[PDB]
Design an enzyme around this catalytic site. Sequence first.
Site, PDB file in Angstrom:
ATOM      1  N   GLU A 212      32.458 -43.195  37.185  1.00 10.18           N
ATOM      2  CA  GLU A 212      31.647 -44.534  37.417  1.00 10.18           C
ATOM      3  C   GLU A 212      30.374 -44.299  37.459  1.00 10.18           C
ATOM      4  O   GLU A 212      29.398 -45.238  36.718  1.00 10.18           O
ATOM      5  CB  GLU A 212      32.081 -45.203  38.887  1.00 10.18           C
ATOM      6  CG  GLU A 212      31.456 -46.430  39.269  1.00 10.18           C
ATOM      7  CD  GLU A 212      31.877 -47.686  38.062  1.00 10.18           C
ATOM      8  OE1 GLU A 212      33.152 -47.647  37.483  1.00 10.18           O
ATOM      9  OE2 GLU A 212      31.339 -48.892  38.203  1.00 10.18           O
ATOM     10  N   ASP A 221      25.817 -55.325  37.862  1.00  8.97           N
ATOM     11  CA  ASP A 221      26.983 -54.900  37.185  1.00  8.97           C
ATOM     12  C   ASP A 221      27.302 -55.739  36.117  1.00  8.97           C
ATOM     13  O   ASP A 221      26.250 -56.732  35.739  1.00  8.97           O
ATOM     14  CB  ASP A 221      28.343 -54.835  38.090  1.00  8.97           C
ATOM     15  CG  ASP A 221      28.645 -56.060  38.560  1.00  8.97           C
ATOM     16  OD1 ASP A 221      28.057 -57.275  38.094  1.00  8.97           O
ATOM     17  OD2 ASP A 221      29.268 -56.333  39.750  1.00  8.97           O
ATOM     18  N   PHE A 305      39.676 -49.331  41.624  1.00 11.84           N
ATOM     19  CA  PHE A 305      38.106 -49.664  41.538  1.00 11.84           C
ATOM     20  C   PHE A 305      37.498 -50.232  40.151  1.00 11.84           C
ATOM     21  O   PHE A 305      36.961 -51.275  40.414  1.00 11.84           O
ATOM     22  CB  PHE A 305      37.773 -48.171  41.715  1.00 11.84           C
ATOM     23  CG  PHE A 305      37.104 -47.772  43.012  1.00 11.84           C
ATOM     24  CD1 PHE A 305      38.137 -47.634  44.106  1.00 11.84           C
ATOM     25  CD2 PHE A 305      35.662 -47.743  43.409  1.00 11.84           C
ATOM     26  CE1 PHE A 305      37.738 -47.220  45.423  1.00 11.84           C
ATOM     27  CE2 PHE A 305      35.263 -47.324  44.556  1.00 11.84           C
ATOM     28  CZ  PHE A 305      36.097 -47.236  45.652  1.00 11.84           C
ATOM     29  N   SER A 318      54.449 -49.032  33.462  1.00 13.90           N
ATOM     30  CA  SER A 318      53.658 -47.966  33.889  1.00 13.90           C
ATOM     31  C   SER A 318      54.162 -47.664  35.349  1.00 13.90           C
ATOM     32  O   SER A 318      54.041 -46.339  35.715  1.00 13.90           O
ATOM     33  CB  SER A 318      52.306 -47.937  33.279  1.00 13.90           C
ATOM     34  OG  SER A 318      52.121 -48.214  32.104  1.00 13.90           O
TER      35      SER A 318
HETATM   36  O1  LIG Z   1      38.075 -54.051  42.844  1.00 10.82           O
HETATM   37  C1  LIG Z   1      37.878 -53.290  44.130  1.00 10.82           C
HETATM   38  C2  LIG Z   1      36.340 -52.783  43.872  1.00 10.82           C
HETATM   39  O2  LIG Z   1      35.668 -53.669  43.020  1.00 10.82           O
HETATM   40  C3  LIG Z   1      34.149 -53.254  43.097  1.00 10.82           C
HETATM   41  O3  LIG Z   1      33.769 -51.832  42.252  1.00 10.82           O
HETATM   42  C4  LIG Z   1      34.137 -52.106  40.903  1.00 10.82           C
HETATM   43  C5  LIG Z   1      33.328 -53.144  40.201  1.00 10.82           C
HETATM   44  O4  LIG Z   1      33.859 -54.476  40.627  1.00 10.82           O
HETATM   45  C6  LIG Z   1      33.562 -53.159  38.525  1.00 10.82           C
HETATM   46  O5  LIG Z   1      32.734 -54.175  38.172  1.00 10.82           O
HETATM   47  C7  LIG Z   1      33.417 -51.754  38.149  1.00 10.82           C
HETATM   48  O6  LIG Z   1      33.808 -51.851  36.729  1.00 10.82           O
HETATM   49  O7  LIG Z   1      33.989 -50.821  38.756  1.00 10.82           O
HETATM   50  C8  LIG Z   1      33.572 -50.844  40.110  1.00 10.82           C
HETATM   51  C9  LIG Z   1      34.109 -49.529  40.820  1.00 10.82           C
HETATM   52  O8  LIG Z   1      34.521 -48.466  39.634  1.00 10.82           O
HETATM   53  C10 LIG Z   1      33.914 -53.280  44.683  1.00 10.82           C
HETATM   54  O9  LIG Z   1      32.631 -53.836  45.097  1.00 10.82           O
HETATM   55  C11 LIG Z   1      34.242 -52.005  45.455  1.00 10.82           C
HETATM   56  O10 LIG Z   1      33.871 -52.030  46.642  1.00 10.82           O
HETATM   57  C12 LIG Z   1      36.048 -52.549  45.539  1.00 10.82           C
HETATM   58  O11 LIG Z   1      36.654 -51.580  46.050  1.00 10.82           O
END
Ligand SMILES: OC[C@H]1O[C@H](O[C@H]2[C@H](O)[C@@H](O)[C@H](O)O[C@@H]2CO)[C@H](O)[C@@H](O)[C@@H]1O
Length: 442
Positions: A212, A221, A305, A318
Amino acid sequence: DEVWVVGMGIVMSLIVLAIVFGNVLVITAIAKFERLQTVTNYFITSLACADLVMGLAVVPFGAAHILMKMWTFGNFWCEFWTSIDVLCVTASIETLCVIAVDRYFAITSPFKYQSLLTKNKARVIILMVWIVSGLTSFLPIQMHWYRATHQEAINCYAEETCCDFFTNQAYAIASSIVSFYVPLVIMVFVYSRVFQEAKRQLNIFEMLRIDEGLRLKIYKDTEGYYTIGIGHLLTKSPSLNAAKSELDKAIGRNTNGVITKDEAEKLFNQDVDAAVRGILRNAKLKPVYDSLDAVRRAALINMVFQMGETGVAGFTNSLRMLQQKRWDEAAVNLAKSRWYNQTPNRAKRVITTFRTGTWDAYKFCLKEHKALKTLGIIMGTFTLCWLPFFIVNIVHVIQDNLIRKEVYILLNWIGYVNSGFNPLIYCRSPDFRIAFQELLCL
Ligand SMILES: OC[C@H]1O[C@H](O[C@H]2[C@H](O)[C@@H](O)[C@H](O)O[C@@H]2CO)[C@H](O)[C@@H](O)[C@@H]1O
Ligand SMILES: CC(C)CCC[C@@H](C)[C@H]1CC[C@H]2[C@@H]3CC=C4C[C@@H](O)CC[C@]4(C)[C@H]3CC[C@]12C
Ligand SMILES: CC(C)CCC[C@@H](C)[C@H]1CC[C@H]2[C@@H]3CC=C4C[C@@H](O)CC[C@]4(C)[C@H]3CC[C@]12C
Ligand SMILES: CC(C)CCC[C@@H](C)[C@H]1CC[C@H]2[C@@H]3CC=C4C[C@@H](O)CC[C@]4(C)[C@H]3CC[C@]12C
Ligand SMILES: CC(C)NC[C@H](O)COc1cccc2[nH]c3ccccc3c12
Ligand SMILES: *C(=O)CCCCCCCCCCCCCCC
């Protein structure tokens, strides 16, 4: 026949040039840029100094010796040149040995990846290393402890045009053991445990860090929402202060949008707790999660995530194959996802993790771990260049003249040529590469 000695001269001359040029470049970069002034890079300087002396004082006269087929620099320089040669090889392996030990304590330290040594204490070590090497190398040669007692050697000693390294077996054994093998064995053992320890430090935090990325500043994001750390959403609100307000609330202080890496790890661990909790609630994800091992549990969390729980529950086929530990079949299906098409590199590592149940896909990904690899290559390269020569040392103690004279000389030159390799290996480092680029008027 005489044409080739010019050609041999050219080649050896280029070798001398390559050794001196690269090592001066290394020494300069570390001395000039404050970024490259670490305890590690102080030892690199000691290592580069030894190689430089080789390129100036040692290798050229060894080349003249071979081309001219005789020693034209007298008996005093012969003993002195021989002393320098031995010293530089002894100093190099000792320095390498110090680096491996230094790296070990740095990585097993609570305060991680930085040395237990102040910049001054490190210098004292270097000085001590050179002194011990000097005592080990210069003393026995100038005290004539090394000399053999049979007639042929005596001719060569007395002869002002003969510079051959004839030795008594006591010296040949003891010297090559103290100077070379002892710091070699230590270095190899210690640094092998450095690698193990680095491999140990791979977990879900490093996994998501690599997959990430960790951001210390508030960012938007893909969806435009305010986020920080490892994909940690602060708020869906369009107001920045609210995102800052949320952040200060979670962190527990006034951040103004900036957090430390360790604070990000707190947030990440905070998120993982929620991620696991949601998985255990999800009817489609809980059976899969229960069945999985810790490493593969991290891969699934990694996916949640990125995609959210709903997205992961989509891989119905899967999920069932993962639950039945049919990894390869699960890999074939996961490869055919929208997920693989958008972010193939990340998906590849996660899928690979599912296959092996190891971290062998998140391996030498961290910048710090890549650095450990470069140091590994330096050590390995040195070992391979010098070990054959040093084996023959001992082989001829057991049974002498087992190996032709031209082969022994050649192996030594493989050892000599090593002095030119280290600067090139440092180009692996992004920081050295940038330092070199500035220094070369590029
Ligand atoms: O869905 C659970 C988590 O989502 C966020 O983190 C993500 C994000 O939504 C997404 O845009 C991106 O592609 O990935 C990240 C993590 O790799 C939350 O804010 C986390 O706190 C949650 O657990
Ligand atoms: C033996 C004769 C022929 C050569 C002398 C060896 C030289 C190259 C050795 C002797 C003492 C060494 C140094 C001792 C102290 C340090 C301080 C550190 O910040 C950089 C390296 C440095 C500067 C060492 C490398 C180079 C060094 C100067
Ligand atoms: C002894 C003969 C044969 C070789 C000449 C030795 C020279 C190349 C060695 C001996 C002492 C060395 C230096 C010792 C002190 C340091 C300070 C460090 O921050 C950068 C390198 C630097 C400046 C060394 C570079 C080169 C150096 C000058
Ligand atoms: C006896 C023989 C080996 C001596 C040869 C000396 C050569 C290798 C020395 C002499 C002048 C040196 C250079 C002087 C100019 C610079 C720019 C500086 O920012 C980095 C080092 C660099 C690029 C030096 C590299 C090597 C260099 C060319
Ligand atoms: C042309 C010759 C003089 N060159 C020797 C090697 O470069 C360096 O060899 C050594 C380095 C350090 C310690 C050593 N002990 C020895 C015993 C016998 C031969 C070489 C070495 C030796
Ligand atoms: C930017 O850093 C690149 C331009 C630097 C040019 C420096 C010119 C050096 C000339 C080298 C000649 C020395 C030869 C010594 C042989 C003994």
